[PDB]
Amino acid sequence: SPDKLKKVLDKLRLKRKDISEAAETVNKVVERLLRRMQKRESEFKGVEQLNTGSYYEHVKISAPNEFDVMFKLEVPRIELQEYYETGAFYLVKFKRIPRGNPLSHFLEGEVLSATKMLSKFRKIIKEEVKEIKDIDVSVEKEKPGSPAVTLLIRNPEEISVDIILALESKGSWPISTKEGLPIQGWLGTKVRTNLRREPFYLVPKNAKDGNSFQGETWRLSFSHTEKYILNNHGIEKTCCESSGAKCCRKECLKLMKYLLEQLKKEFQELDAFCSYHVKTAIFHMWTQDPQDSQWDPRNLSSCFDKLLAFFLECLRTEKLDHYFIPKFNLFSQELIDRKSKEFLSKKIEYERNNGFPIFDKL
Ligand SMILES: [Zn+2]
């Protein structure tokens, strides 16, 4: 018979079925909205959905009726200024644009104001969504401190869709990423070169650090690159394809994400942890153990355990480098209290030694 891990994987997959019709309504609405926004004359006319993946391995931890989508907007001629030395935050300035900067009126001094740009973004979405007549779509009351523009869809049960604006820049990647994406021994040098020729994204995010520059800071996003890696994750090109062999790489990611999700429900001490920490850890593990034969499906329980051990060691050393931005320590004392990491370590060790009873629930 199958062990608990395989049962949990089966159950996780079957959950996709309960979310499918809502997911379809979401795509319907988003696509209508994008068309309306693309028809209209505004600084957001060029907006498009950035595809980041929708399966459990790709998305953040969420309620079954909560969705997130990123709307990307190409912004030519950005001059980036590192705001944090780690590369955690940036200010957005501009180089010379002889024909005129189309985002000119979103500037505050030399810097692009996320506050001004999001305010207009919110206003336009609210106006267009009012024109959707066949399905009840409104905009949730703005949550001070949250940049998402949240759609509420009622058909007739309520679905929430957080819309996140992402600036698209086609310039070379920021200097803070120079040693990031360490995939040379795994996906290799040509893939790394190709991936780094793609755009990078900037998403509005406030730092929690005083009044100066609030509403003017952005963090980098590589959601596109991350999707690509998740779906092209083998040293062999045929990994998980029909004329290749399956590996257990995504299964380990899913198990570890679900472990954290279930733990986060039980213990609000774990509020500062998110699925991105898990995805980051596993990117590092995929780099350390690049061979597809080091992720054989036969070895699921051993591979999951070596991922736990790795994550536990990141917790113990208080260090988990962003995979794209090596100086950005996601497990710094300032982002996550030492006592929270010690608490999570203790919970993980407990689960690992008792056959994962937290997976026994619904
Ligand atoms: Zn594979």
Side-chain angles (χ1 to χ4, degrees), residues 159-172:
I159 301 171
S160 293
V161 185
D162 280 9
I163 300 177
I164 292 95
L165 166 72
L167 267 30
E168 184 179 71
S169 182
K170 295 184 159 58
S172 45

Side-chain angles (χ1 to χ4, degrees), residues 233-234 239-240 245-249:
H233 54 241
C239 189
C240 290
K246 301 214 204 306
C247 69
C248 66
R249 280 191 184 89

